[PDB]
Amino acid sequence: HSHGLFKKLGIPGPTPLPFLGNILSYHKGFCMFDMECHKKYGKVWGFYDGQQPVLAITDPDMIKTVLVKECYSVFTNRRPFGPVGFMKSAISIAEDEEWKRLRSLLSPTFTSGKLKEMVPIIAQYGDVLVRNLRREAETGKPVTLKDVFGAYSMDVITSTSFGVNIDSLNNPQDPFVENDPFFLSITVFPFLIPILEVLNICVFPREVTNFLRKSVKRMKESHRVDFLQLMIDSKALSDLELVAQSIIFIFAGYETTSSVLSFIMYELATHPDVQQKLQEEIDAVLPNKAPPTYDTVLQMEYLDMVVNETLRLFPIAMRLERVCKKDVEINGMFIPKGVVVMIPSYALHRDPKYWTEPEKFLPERFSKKNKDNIDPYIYTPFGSGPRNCIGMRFALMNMKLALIRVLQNFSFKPCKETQIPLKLSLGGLLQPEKPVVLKVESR
Amino acid sequence: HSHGLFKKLGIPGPTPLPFLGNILSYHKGFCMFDMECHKKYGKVWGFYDGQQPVLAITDPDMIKTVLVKECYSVFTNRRPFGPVGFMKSAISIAEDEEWKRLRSLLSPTFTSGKLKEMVPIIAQYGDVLVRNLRREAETGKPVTLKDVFGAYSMDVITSTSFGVNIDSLNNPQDPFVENDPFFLSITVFPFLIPILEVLNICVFPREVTNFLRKSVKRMKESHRVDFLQLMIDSKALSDLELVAQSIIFIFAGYETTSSVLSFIMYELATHPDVQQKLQEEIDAVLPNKAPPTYDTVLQMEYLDMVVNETLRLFPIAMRLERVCKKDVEINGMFIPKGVVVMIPSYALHRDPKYWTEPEKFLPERFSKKNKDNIDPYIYTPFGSGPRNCIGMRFALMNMKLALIRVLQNFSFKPCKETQIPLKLSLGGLLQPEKPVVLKVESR
Numbered sequence: 015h016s017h018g019l020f021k022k023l024g025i026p027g028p029t030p031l032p033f034l035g036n037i038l039s040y041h042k043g044f045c046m047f048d049m050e051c052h053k054k055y056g057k058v059w060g061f062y063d064g065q066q067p068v069l070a071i072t073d074p075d076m077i078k079t080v081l082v083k084e085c086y087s088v089f090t091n092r093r094p095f096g097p098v099g100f101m102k103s104a105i106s107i108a109e110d111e112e113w114k115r116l117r118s119l120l121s122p123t124f125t126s127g128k129l130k131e132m133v134p135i136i137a138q139y140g141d142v143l144v145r146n147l148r149r150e151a152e153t154g155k156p157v158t159l160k161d162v163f164g165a166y167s168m169d170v171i172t173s174t175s176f177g178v179n180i181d182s183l184n185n186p187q188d189p190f191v192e193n194d195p196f197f198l199s200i201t202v203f204p205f206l207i208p209i210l211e212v213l214n215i216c217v218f219p220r221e222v223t224n225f226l227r228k229s230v231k232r233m234k235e236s237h238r239v240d241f242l243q244l245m246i247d248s249k250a251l252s253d254l255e256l257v258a259q260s261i262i263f264i265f266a267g268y269e270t271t272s273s274v275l276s277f278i279m280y281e282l283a284t285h286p287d288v289q290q291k292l293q294e295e296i297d298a299v300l301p302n303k304a305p306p307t308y309d310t311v312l313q314m315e316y317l318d319m320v321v322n323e324t325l326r327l328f329p330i331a332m333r334l335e336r337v338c339k340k341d342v343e344i345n346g347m348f349i350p351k352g353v354v355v356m357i358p359s360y361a362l363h364r365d366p367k368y369w370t371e372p373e374k375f376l377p378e379r380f381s382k383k384n385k386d387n388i389d390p391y392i393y394t395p396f397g398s399g400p401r402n403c404i405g406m407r408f409a410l411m412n413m414k415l416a417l418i419r420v421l422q423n424f425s426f427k428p429c430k431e432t433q434i435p436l437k438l439s440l441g442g443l444l445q446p447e448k449p450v451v452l453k454v455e456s457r
Numbered sequence: 458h459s460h461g462l463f464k465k466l467g468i469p470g471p472t473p474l475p476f477l478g479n480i481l482s483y484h485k486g487f488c489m490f491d492m493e494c495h496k497k498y499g500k501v502w503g504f505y506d507g508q509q510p511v512l513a514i515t516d517p518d519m520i521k522t523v524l525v526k527e528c529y530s531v532f533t534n535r536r537p538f539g540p541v542g543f544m545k546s547a548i549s550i551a552e553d554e555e556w557k558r559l560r561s562l563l564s565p566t567f568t569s570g571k572l573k574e575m576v577p578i579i580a581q582y583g584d585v586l587v588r589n590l591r592r593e594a595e596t597g598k599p600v601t602l603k604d605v606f607g608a609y610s611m612d613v614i615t616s617t618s619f620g621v622n623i624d625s626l627n628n629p630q631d632p633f634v635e636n637d638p639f640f641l642s643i644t645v646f647p648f649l650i651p652i653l654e655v656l657n658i659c660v661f662p663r664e665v666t667n668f669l670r671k672s673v674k675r676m677k678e679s680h681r682v683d684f685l686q687l688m689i690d691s692k693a694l695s696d697l698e699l700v701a702q703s704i705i706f707i708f709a710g711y712e713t714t715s716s717v718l719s720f721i722m723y724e725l726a727t728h729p730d731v732q733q734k735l736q737e738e739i740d741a742v743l744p745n746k747a748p749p750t751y752d753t754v755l756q757m758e759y760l761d762m763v764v765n766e767t768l769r770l771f772p773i774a775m776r777l778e779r780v781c782k783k784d785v786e787i788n789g790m791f792i793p794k795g796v797v798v799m800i801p802s803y804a805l806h807r808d809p810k811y812w813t814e815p816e817k818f819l820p821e822r823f824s825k826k827n828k829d830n831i832d833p834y835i836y837t838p839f840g841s842g843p844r845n846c847i848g849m850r851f852a853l854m855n856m857k858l859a860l861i862r863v864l865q866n867f868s869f870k871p872c873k874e875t876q877i878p879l880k881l882s883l884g885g886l887l888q889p890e891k892p893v894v895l896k897v898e899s900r
């Protein structure tokens with residue numbers, strides 16, 4: 015019974031219940047629980063995910079020590095969840111030297127030279143997204159963004175990860191990836207995890223994967239550029255190791271790209287002045303609906319300010335977590351072994367200590383005048399340090415290339431069904447209660 | 458399902474059954490299973506303790522690499538058993554840097570200077586053992602050795618570990634330590650170990666310990682020398698850490714000292730020529746039943762030859778085990794991570810490759826002429842390397858000091874109930890089927 019740990023260290027926090035800990039406070043959500051704790055407990059507090067002590071830090075120098083300084087020594091891996099199966103070889107689930115080999119083997123896949131080669135492929139579906147948009151604009155009714163953006167993010171994934179060119183929205187019969195009530199029990203009962211592993215049970219639907227893996231056996235052997243072809247050229251890797259990384263690239267590129275693009279278009283439709291100014295910049299850099307290029311995207315500054323400010327209001331990861339590998343003492347406080355150090359990214363992005371009017375959508379926070387006054391460890395939408403988001407530059411380029419072609423042809427206004435203000439899904443995922451619906455008018 | 462590992466590496470061994478592995482071959486015992494495997498599979502073979510692959514090595518250079526060379530790097534810890542409770546801080550159960558701190562903090566307790574201070578204490582009970590022997594000799598009937606030796610080993614433990622002077626055989630109402638059907642299930646079902654730990658269940662009777670711990674709270678604080686006083690003088694230790702080590706000293710000093718002394722007196726009674734020659738040397742170094750001292754024991758060579766030769770026939774540990782911490786390659790073979798490397802000490806001590814007439818009791822193998830021709834890694838009754846038996850010199854001095862006072866007064870002859878030949882307990886423990894009973898005559 016380690017529930018007396020945070021009071022044995024003099025660290026404030028909510029009082030844990032037996033077995034459950036503080037998981038009953040998650041009825042508001044992880045975001046609201048972190049904002050309420052940071053408000054009443056200060057810079058450092060602790061809580062218990064069942065029997066697992068979780069220490070939350072908000073000090074920028076202390077965050078820098080965890081994410082960047084003592085990364086390879088103390089804070090190398092995140093906390094493990096339940097039955098992972100063969101997915102233990104995922105770069106995000108790998109630990110210690112196992113991860114260092116994968117992070118070094120997959121880093122060249124996200125080079126500035128390799129990414130510029132991917133711009134023409136994902137810009138093709140930017141035209142396909144407009145094709146499905148023009149129809150759902152000429153059909154004359156509000157459009158659910160997560161459908162067209164989910165299809166776009168799916169098409170971008172398949173062509174960049176394997177090259178299987180599909181129109182996910184127009185070919186939904188073959189998607190082929192249409193893929194609390196247990197994870198609440200799994201964290202309070204971590205002793206049941208080895209039982210599910212020996213039963214071949216996994217948190218992911220285990221019957222999947224196998225149909226995505228046998229497709230790599232025919233195309234890897236029996237001039238095209240994609241994530242797969244860049245991994246085969248590369249001690250050396252395994253065939254099953256190649257499958258696990260491609261699965262984590264789809265999960266990290268599907269729900270993330272669509273949700274952020276959904277939050278962005280919600281902020282643009284609710285702020286026509288920002289949408290008006292952004293479309294003027296898009297028309298200025300790209301005259302007469304010019305095709306967006308790699309060098310063109312990296313020039314539009316107001317587009318970068320819009321993407322950065324929406325990621326502040328909605329950091330879809332919510333938290334940054336590291337596992338304390340041994341008894342250490344960082345920046346003046348003692349961290350015992352086994353404690354999960356957590357960085358509340360959502361709570362820090364809405365703190366009046368660093369942001370003026372946190373609930374407001376003000377893209378001018380990230381202009382070249384005020385961008386220098388932003389702490390790189392208070393604003394971490396992609397994490398930081400050696401274990402940051404390895405697909406950060408790919409996601410930014412993928413999302414912006416869609417925002418240009420979408421705004422080059424359409425203006426977005428709210429509808430009667432648009433949930434204003436937007437209510438964050440009290441669930442576990444950082445999304446909105448009711449899906450975003452907007453009016454799409456042709457320019 | 459890792460049962461194809463040893464055949465994926467080209468390593469011979471018995472074919473494992475699902476779930477069970479090769480545990481059904483333990484109906485003969487660990488000793489006979491290791492002798493049958495070393496006979497038909499050669500220098501290296503592998504088997505499965507349920508789902509745990511165990512690689513057995515017999516090459517002396519390969520044993521030296523595991524026990525001595527790559528000890529701190531690869532082969533640092535032994536395999537873990539079931540619910541350990543607070544006993545995870547035991548030096549023998551500790552792992553990695555946690556063990557290095559305990560092995561360094563407890564090594565001075567077994568110094569040649571500290572041990573010579575313990576000789577007068579354990580020689581006192583050598584007189585008490587003769588006192589109970591003279592009565593059970595004058596009572597005129599065969600004597601069960603494990604009773605008088607178990608009481609002697611218990612009295613030596615209590616006085617050396619805490620100083621509580623008792624006559625365990627004459628005060629058995631207050632001992633106070635009178636302390637397969639589950640461990641076979643626990644190794645085939647290792648997924649049930651975390652369940653027993655969270656239920657406060659331990660492999661040891663958990664209701665014990667607590668009554669031995671509250672006695673240290675009154676005597677540690679509220680000039681005497683013992684194992685306890687030598688540990689208090691000593692980053693620094695914890696109070697609960699001091700309790701765990703004293704428990705492992707009793708378990709390692711009770712069953713081991715009594716059983717080896719039981720095997721020795723069986724070999725002496727069945728070989729009167731060895732008992733006659735040993736008593737003549739004891740009378741020569743110690744004239745007229747002289748009291749044995751520290752320097753006297755280290756002079757009797759034939760006594761050392763008798764103790765060493767009995768430990769060859771009965772290495773009560775049977776096996777030496779280390780856990781492979783990472784993928785390595787020792788002396789020309791690849792050892793994957795997680796494989797338990799095992800040294801069959803019993804099988805090596807009875808191998809005709811290094812011993813002539815292995816089943817014979819010939820103390821002349823360890824004379825100063827033939828002791829140089831014995832490989833220190835084929836004969837390992839106390840292990841080897843940094844994680845060898847830390848109480849080796851204490852056990853040798855404790856057992857010899859009893860053998861001198863016992864043989865200074867009594868001769869030992871077999872009886873009608875003496876099991877000849879001695880049948881090793883088919884159980885898990887390295888002992889004899891039926892307890893040893895001998896005739897004790899006064900000189």
Ligand code: HEM
Pocket residue numbers: 081105106107117262263266267270271274330331334335394395396397398399400401402403404405406408409
């Ligand atoms: C808007 C889009 C995205 C956001 C906001 C985002 C955010 C994040 C964050 C906050 C982390 C944790 C960083 C840390 O713990 O220090 C992370 C990790 C990671 N992300 Fe993303 N991500 C996005 C898209 C992607 C994409 C498109 C990919 C791949 C194609 C990707 C692959 C990964 C991987 C593999 C990791 C784990 C890296 C490791 O453990 O070494 N992410 N991401």
Ligand code: HEM
Pocket residue numbers: 524548549550560705706709710713714717773774777778837838839840841842843844845846847848849851852
């Ligand atoms: C005839 C008596 C004894 C024999 C034959 C014996 C044998 C052994 C063997 C074979 C090992 C394993 C070595 C290895 O794995 O490399 C061991 C370990 C150990 N023994 Fe003994 N032992 C005896 C008595 C004792 C006594 C009297 C004590 C303490 C008072 C003791 C304390 C220990 C400890 C603590 C370990 C584990 C050391 C570590 O893990 O670092 N043993 N013993």
